[PDB]
C-alpha cells in the first residue's frame, strides 16, 4: 500500500490532483505539499486543509472570519482533520495524520478555497 502522497501547489492557484486515495490499510498517512513556481508565501502562499465534505464551507467561512493572522483557519476548530503551514515558493511541508480520524472528505487551500479536491479511503 501506497500510504503518503506528494502534492503541488503552483503560482496559478491550482494544486496539481483534486483527488487523493488513502488505502484502507494504512494506519497513518502523510501529504508532502509543495510549492513550484516562484511567488512568495506573502503574494501566493497555499496551504493543505482537510474536513468532512460537508464541514467544508463552515471551516471556510469561520476561517475567513479568522483572517489573514491566523492562515484563514478558526485555531482548533474541530472539523478540520488535519491541516499544513502555509508555504510558498521553493518552501515545502509535510503533515501525516490517523487514519482512524476518517464519509466523504476534502482538501482545500485556506487562502484559496476554490482550491480543492476529494480525499477518500479505499
Ligand atoms: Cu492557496
Redesign the pocket.
Known amino acids: 500500500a501506497e500510504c503518503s502522497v506528494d502534492i503541488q501547489?503552483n503560482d496559478q492557484?491550482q494544486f496539481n490532483t483534486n483527488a487523493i486515495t488513502v488505502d484502507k490499510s494504512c494506519k497513518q498517512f502523510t501529504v508532502n505539499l509543495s510549492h513550484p513556481g516562484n511567488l512568495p508565501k506573502n503574494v501566493?502562499?497555499?496551504?493543505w486543509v482537510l474536513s468532512t465534505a460537508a464541514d467544508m464551507q463552515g471551516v471556510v467561512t469561520d476561517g475567513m472570519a479568522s483572517g489573514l493572522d491566523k492562515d484563514y483557519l478558526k485555531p482548533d476548530d474541530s472539523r478540520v482533520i488535519a491541516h499544513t503551514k502555509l508555504i510558498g515558493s521553493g518552501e515545502k511541508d509535510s503533515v501525516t495524520f490517523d487514519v482512524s480520524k476518517l464519509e466523504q472528505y476534502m482538501f482545500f487551500?485556506?487562502?484559496?478555497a476554490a482550491?480543492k479536491g476529494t480525499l477518500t479511503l479505499k
Not at 501566493?44 to 496551504?47: E, F, K, L, R, V
Not at 487551500?109 to 484559496?112: G, L
Open positions: 501547489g492557484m501566493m502562499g497555499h496551504n487551500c485556506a487562502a484559496h482550491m
